[PDB]
């Protein structure tokens, strides 16, 4: 069914004319920020043009399919509804604040372990949900796919790859997403991408295979649980890399499943800082 917006359990009949375009978000894919004139809600809207590339449109529809089926996972960006016009398809998504990549750039430094713990719990459960309930492999985990908002939520988006986060077995032939998560955790925890000064994508792949896993430093106060979780994620031999069932029992996951962390206040403090 299309032509309806469902925000907070309230289904509203709506058409494309009921949305006010507040401008494109980011650059490079065209995601608008729009306002629902009937309630005042602000939402993210993905526009798929009928005259667009048949390859990108085919990918958007399959990714929309997974998104529409993930309505029961709280760690995946939710779809509020769709609009199908004669020349376009508009996909309405819940509006988040920004991604972890832009949080890193705005922080201009490492991201605290407390925040990365809640992020690790959310992303692993999002990946385990996609695998167990839908048989979907993400195949592209990176900081630009991890969204946060003012309310402290951390959710996964844009699944359906980037060579910088590719696992060793994907480079030189299930658990491949575990490796990409560990690289993302090192990058966010240190503020530096672990494979530095690589001028080409191939140079990154050579360092992935030839060099030892880039684990967390020992002089930054990281807890033993965090260093252990990253070391487990960055297992180069994909046959010894833990399943999602094993990762969900890791003490790092168990700690931040129950620990109270004010991600909302931390998010607002970082956004209040200025880069321009
Ligand atoms: C690192 C973050 C970043 O630079 N950007 C660029 C501008 C758009 C930002 N953004 N994206 C979403 C978002 C994206 N989706 C997925 C989709 F809707 F595009 C899609 C659905 C179905 C099939 C294919 C694609 N959902 N949300 C953002 C949200 N939701 N809030 C705030 N900013 C978002 C990320």
Residue numbers in the entry: 118 to 145, 148 to 279, 295 to 307, 317 to 419
From the paper:
The direct activators of JNKs are the MAP2Ks MKK7 and MKK4.29 Targeting upstream kinases of MKK4/7 has been met with limited success due to possible activator redundancy, whereas targeting JNK itself has not shown clinical success yet, perhaps due to on-target toxicity. We successfully determined six novel MKK7-ligand complexes with three members of each series: 1a, 1h, 1k and 2a, 2b, 2c.
Throughout series 1, the 4-amino-pyrazolopyrimidine core forms the expected hinge contacts to Glu213 and Met215, as well as a covalent bond between the piperidine-linked acrylamide and the thiol side chain of Cys218. Two common structural features were enriched in the top hits originating from derivatization of 1: halogenated hydroxyphenyls and phenethyl derivatives. All selected compounds derived from 1 showed a significant improvement in their inhibitory ability compared to the parent scaffold.
